[PDB]
Design a protein around this ligand. Structure first.
Ligand SMILES: CC(=O)c1cccc(O)c1
Length: 425
């Protein structure tokens, strides 16, 4: 498939916005340096103006008025701390055409082929050289359209990013803003002086694999029916042992991964779980809080135990890790991060999620399919390509059947067994 760009432009806020330097909290600093990829897919609705770029950009400019930090640029203060220069330079909007079809992506497994649907960024010209948000509307050879999104997570996390996209689509349909964004990250300032309370196991080195081959990593996606999810939930009754569907599913995935990887009985495994601090921070963050509030629960386990014990054993560990992440624990994290000499060094990479470990996040809660720009909701949305092994995304169904999908990156030889184990319910 070849893709070629008809036009690219910088879309600025439709009206005047504050000219300020937006301070970043420690959560807003422990982020990747690249743009986080995500992709929306749409089927033709039969409309003559399907995804009219003028309509899209008009609404984009209107949304960037309240979401003005999105149209800003990265800068560093006198101490070298990354902050957001809200200068309204604008976000990048790319219109592109494809000689292929939406069907070419099949089940929309998040392979690196999705990256082509998202504008590339030159990271060699300073952190101030590129927009915080890059957008690509691609028209396929079937009438279908993809919306590719690259968002610098110095701006905000995926939760606020989703808040922006849905607001954009709302305005594209003529709607006014439902939830106005709150823009002040000083609410997540560390205490003075910083008083950490736990050692924070989340930032400790993960279990290793004695060795380490090269690894041919593949990406797949598997649908689980509502009945399959219901059957998995009542497995909490096993061995005379209630955990939620999410806790049980994440435990199920964690367990299946260990068995698929053929982990030794004694091998330790560490699970990384993205959790939203918005729910537990005190006092409650204002609705529409614009920034990063995503933390990580990291339960430890023995591969032999996960396999020989019921799923609720895995779920219990997951539940315990999440339960101890109250306000005090998160407040301690801000203080612990504050004392760290290098925050970027704490950002997790391929090494973190290599065998025997795993990272998981669940997007079912998000209104990820509420991005209706006037021509219908997305037929799919997911991460814009997964680069390395050991990442899993739990995606809800676009339909109302209550099914979900587990997208995941594993070694090629491990992926085949994982599919078998995932459906052993
Ligand atoms: C994005 C994602 O899937 C993930 C999973 C675990 C940890 C983490 O920081 C991120």
């Amino acid at each position: 498939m070849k893709i070629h760009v008809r036009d690219s432009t910088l879309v600025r806020p439709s009206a005047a916005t504050p000219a300020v330097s937006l301070w970043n909290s420690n959560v807003d600093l422990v982020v990747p340096n690249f743009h986080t990829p995500s992709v929306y897919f749409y089927r033709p609705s039969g409309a003559d103006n399907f995804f009219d770029t003028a309509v899209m950009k008009a609404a984009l400019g209107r949304a960037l008025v309240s979401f003005y930090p999105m149209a800003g640029r990265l800068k560093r203060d006198e101490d070298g701390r990354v902050e957001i220069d809200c200068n309204a330079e604008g976000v990048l909007f790319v219109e592109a055409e494809s000689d292929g079809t939406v069907d070419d992506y099949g089940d929309f497994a998040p392979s690196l082929e999705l990256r082509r649907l998202i504008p590339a960024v030159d990271y060699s010209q300073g952190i101030s050289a590129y927009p915080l948000l890059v957008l690509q509307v691609t028209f396929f050879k079937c009438g279908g359209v993809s919306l590719g999104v690259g968002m610098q997570h110095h701006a905000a996390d995926g939760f606020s990013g989703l808040h922006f996209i849905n607001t954009w689509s709302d305005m594209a349909r003529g709607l006014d803003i439902t939830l106005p964004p709150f823009i002040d990250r000083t609410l997540l300032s560390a205490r003075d002086p910083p008083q950490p309370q736990f050692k924070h196991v989340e930032y400790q080195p993960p279990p290793a694999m004695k060795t380490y081959e090269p690894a041919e990593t593949v990406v797949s996606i598997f649908k689980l029916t509502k009945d399959q999810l219901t059957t998995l939930k009542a497995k909490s009754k096993e061995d005379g042992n209630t955990y939620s569907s999410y806790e049980m599913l994440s435990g199920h995935v964690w367990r299946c991964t260990c068995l698929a990887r053929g982990l030794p009985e004694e091998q330790e495994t560490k699970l990384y779980i993205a959790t939203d601090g918005r729910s537990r921070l005190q006092p409650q963050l204002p609705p529409g809080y614009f920034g990063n509030v995503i933390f990580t629960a990291t339960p430890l386990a023995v591969a032999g135990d996960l396999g020989s014990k019921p799923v609720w054993y895995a779920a219990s560990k997951i539940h315990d890790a999440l339960a101890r992440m109250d306000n005090d624990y998160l407040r301690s994290a801000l203080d612990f991060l504050e004392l760290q000499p290098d925050l970027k060094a704490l950002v997790r990479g391929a090494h973190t999620f290599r065998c025997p470990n795993l990272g998981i996040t669940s997007w079912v809660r998000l209104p990820i399919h509420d991005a209706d720009f006037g021509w219908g909701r997305p037929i799919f949305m997911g991460p814009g390509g997964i680069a390395y092994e050991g990442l899993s995304f739990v995606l809800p169904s676009p339909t109302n059947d209550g099914s979900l999908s587990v997208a995941i990156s594993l070694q090629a030889e491990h992926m085949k067994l994982f599919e078998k184990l995932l459906y052993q319910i």
